[PDB]
């Protein structure tokens, strides 16, 4: 809400979930899945079903993800999802008088951003659109201007160093493991126990099982010793139809694919070695500032025991590959992993802070008129 009476809306479009709200708030107003479903029953209620209810009866439909790692695949499904977002079921706003802040993943093509700005200005006709980088918003939410952001969501896990409020583009790294790969590996591990689940019709049940029971083991020699002698790791879960399943030693085996990618046939190294190589690839005088401020983000870093394991692996790598002979020199060096419990929505809080600061400055936003007698060149004000 600015001085002229126009509402400011912060929208974060993920591969899996759309999180939308207003500027200045500390909580997201709505979180819902991002999928568009069509009835396969007519191929064998409503012809176009979109939203979380389309995630309810997933087995009755066939589904499509319109967004894939910040790249729009199906434009009509993305227009239907944005029509559902700015509608009376979720937000109930009049888009003729609003301003909107949208996010953007690192290493994005320019043509996708131009098309997104053209759809927001021509179809919905907003009064002001701004596009921001997600890592800068993640550091803005915590209170820092210099750090290394490790964000694992639903698409591609990214490691990005940001220095003095600007993201360095020639040092960012990516790893192709996220929550869908962990869910597929959990389906593959649960097939050996005897529970058979479909890869498309039963994705949400295994997603809720993964959100409920899975964790990351600290010592990976102690967990299966506890799993070979005791029955304390076996937990009972109730399916929606009525059956009761038992999940045992697979709780600590699936997120171990984050640290060992060759379990899911992906070449490369783990997240800790990639983080060490990303920090060590920078110049010498700014290494310790990157080591003192490492911020985790994303919904896939919500496993219990993950930052303790990450700090242990990073300290072991820095001991073995840099100092190489002394445990006394390791104590003076400072390595900090920042793990707040609100880390699932850092991008929304950073967008809310940045929209609440700059809600009155006319030079920040780009208006409808500056699109109207310049076209695509209004994106020249972005950077």
């Amino acid at each position: 809400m600015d001085s002229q009476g126009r509402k400011v809306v912060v929208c974060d479009n993920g591969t899996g979930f759309v999180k939308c709200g207003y500027a200045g708030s500390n909580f997201p107003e709505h979180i819902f899945p991002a999928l568009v479903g069509r009835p396969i029953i007519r191929s064998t209620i409503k012809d176009l079903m979109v939203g979380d209810e389309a995630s309810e009866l997933r087995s009755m439909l066939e589904v499509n993800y319109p967004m894939e790692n910040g790249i729009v695949r199906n434009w009509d499904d993305m227009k239907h999802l944005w029509d559902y977002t700015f509608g009376p079921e979720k937000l109930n706003i009049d888009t003729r008088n609003c301003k909107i802040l949208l996010t953007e993943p690192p290493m994005n093509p320019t043509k996708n951003r131009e098309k997104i700005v053209e759809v927001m200005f021509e179809t919905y006709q907003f009064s002001g659109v701004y596009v921001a980088i997600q890592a800068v918003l993640t550091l803005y939410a915590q209170g820092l201007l210099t750090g290394v952001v490790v964000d694992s969501g639903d698409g591609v896990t990214h490691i990005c160093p940001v220095y003095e409020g600007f993201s360095l583009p020639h040092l960012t790294r990516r790893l192709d493991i996220a929550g869908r790969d962990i869910t597929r590996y959990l389906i593959k591990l649960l097939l050996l126990r005897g529970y058979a689940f479909n890869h498309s019709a039963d994705f949400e049940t295994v997603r809720m099982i993964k959100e409920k029971l899975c964790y990351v083991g600290y010592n990976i020699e102690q967990e299966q010793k506890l799993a070979l002698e005791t029955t304390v790791l076996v937990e009972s879960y109730t399916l929606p139809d009525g059956r009761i399943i038992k999940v045992g030693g697979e709780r600590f085996e699936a997120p171990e694919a984050l640290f060992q990618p060759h379990l899911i046939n992906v070449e490369g190294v783990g997240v800790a070695e990639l983080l060490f190589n990303t920090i060590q690839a920078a110049d010498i005088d700014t290494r310790s500032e990157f080591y003192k401020h490492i911020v985790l983000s994303g919904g896939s870093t919500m496993y219990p025991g993950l930052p303790s394991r990450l700090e242990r692996e990073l300290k072991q790598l820095y001991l073995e590959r840099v100092l190489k002979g002394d445990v006394e020199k390791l104590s003076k060096f400072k390595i900090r992993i920042e793990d707040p419990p609100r880390r699932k929505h850092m991008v929304f809080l950073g967008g809310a802070v940045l929209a609440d600061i700059m809600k009155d400055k006319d030079n920040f936003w780009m208006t409808r008129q500056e699109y109207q007698e310049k076209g695509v060149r209004v994106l020249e004000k972005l950077g």
């Binding site: 915590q142 209170g143 820092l144 201007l145 409020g165 707040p340 802070v353 600061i357 400055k361 030079n363």
Partner: protein, 32 residues
């Protein structure tokens, strides 16, 4: 305004509130 401005002391206040662990990073007023 722009890049450096009111944003700087907003980030200072947020770093004071959220990161308060730095003012204990290390390991007559009550006369009565």
């Amino acid at each position: 305004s722009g890049i450096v401005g009111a944003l700087m002391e907003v980030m200072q206040k947020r770093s004071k509130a959220i990161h308060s662990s730095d003012e204990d990073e290390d390991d007559d007023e009550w006369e009565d």
